[PDB]
């Protein structure tokens, strides 16, 4: 059971203080909820910071971009805090927080890698799917270059395979601004 | 059914700053526990929190979300092992405020090395192996800091499943006291 406080479930109580918890795989349902929360919070107060806590192995790239584009669109700064793990599209969203306000807790893990997918059918269909996922990767790499200060060439090399970073390494890389120390 | 008091029983305990970790540790459980810790700190940054642990362990990253949150917040978090604290469960038991880590007399504590998996190309297996070995180094280092035992001793003692009585857990430095009955 999710506990109740007094009547709010604990996550709803955090949302009252402008905290959004991304604590699962990213799919369309999760993105729809997060997007809705971001829009609600902006409507409530267009100036106060929002806090996005991230513990996520990633998931759908398009669902991830729904969240990403909403973060960049709205007026309030969105702080990002990685607890536990931010992998794949999870680490992309961590890097997408307001500059100066991207954090990881000291034992949190950040993982970056290239997008995954599938293609089945005629040669021409496989070609279309390949071109699509390669364009998707170029788009991710470009944005990650802008958000980190690393070159596109370095991002490409460093995401070729699963690349696990400590919080401190993520800071050195430019994925976060600070390690949140106790 | 979970009984009601006039609150479900767990929510009633949360009102007195008691958090129940009574299951496997996964992302959902960690998200709830983290949220509870943050809520309790916001209510009162000075009063102790009590974390009751009966858990066979689970996700290391989920476990570290909880661990880092415990160390981050201002209040002391007391840990009490009832029944069993195994694997990441025993790690969290050891993570309580020094002097305020307890086990009931017939409680079981088990320590062991992390578990995982790797499938694919040699290079992929190498990356996964390096990752889980780094994870183990990180756990062992922190457990060394929390218990006073050397990293070398932790390594040897977690090579296989190692079951401790409450009294042995105290001797090891995982807890401070066995909670004896009046």
């Amino acid at each position: 059971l999710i506990p109740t406080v007094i009547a709010y479930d604990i996550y709803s109580r955090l949302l009252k203080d402008r905290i959004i918890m991304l604590g699962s795989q990213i799919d369309d349902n999760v993105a729809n909820s997060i997007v809705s929360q971001l829009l609600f919070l902006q409507a409530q107060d267009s100036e106060k910071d929002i806090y996005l806590y991230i513990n996520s192995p990633g998931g759908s790239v398009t669902a991830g971009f729904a969240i990403y584009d909403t973060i960049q669109h709205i007026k309030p700064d969105v702080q990002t805090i990685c607890i536990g793990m931010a992998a794949s599209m999870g680490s992309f969203l961590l890097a997408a927080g307001a500059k100066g306000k991207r954090f990881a807790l000291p034992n949190a893990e950040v993982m970056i890698h290239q997008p995954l997918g599938g293609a089945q059918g005629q040669a021409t269909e496989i070609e279309i799917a390949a071109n699509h996922i390669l364009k998707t990767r170029e788009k991710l790499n470009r944005i990650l270059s802008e958000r980190t200060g690393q070159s596109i060439e370095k991002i490409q090399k460093d995401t070729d395979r699963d690349n696990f970073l400590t919080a401190e390494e993520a800071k050195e890389y430019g994925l976060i601004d600070e390690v949140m120390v106790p | 059914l979970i009984p009601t008091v006039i609150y479900d029983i767990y929510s009633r305990l949360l009102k007195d700053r008691i958090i129940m970790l009574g299951s496997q540790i996964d992302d959902n459980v960690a998200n709830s526990i983290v949220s509870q810790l943050l809520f309790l700190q916001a209510q009162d940054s000075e009063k102790d929190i009590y974390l009751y642990i009966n858990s066979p362990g689970g996700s290391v990253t989920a476990g570290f979300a909880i661990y880092d949150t415990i160390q981050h917040i201002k209040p002391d978090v007391q840990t009490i092992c009832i029944g069993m604290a195994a694997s990441m469960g025993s790690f969290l038991l050891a993570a309580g405020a020094k002097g305020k880590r307890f086990a009931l007399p017939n409680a079981e504590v088990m320590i062991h090395q992390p578990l995982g998996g790797a499938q694919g190309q040699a290079t992929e297996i190498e990356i996964a192996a390096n990752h889980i070995l780094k994870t183990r180094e990180k756990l062992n280092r922190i457990l060394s800091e929390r218990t006073g035992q050397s990293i070398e001793k932790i390594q040897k003692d977690t090579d296989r499943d190692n079951f401790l009585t409450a009294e042995e857990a105290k001797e090891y430095g995982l807890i401070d006291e066995v909670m004896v009955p009046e």
Partner: peptide, 6 residues
Amino acid sequence: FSPXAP
């Protein structure tokens, strides 16, 4: 997690 987030 405050300060500073809130």
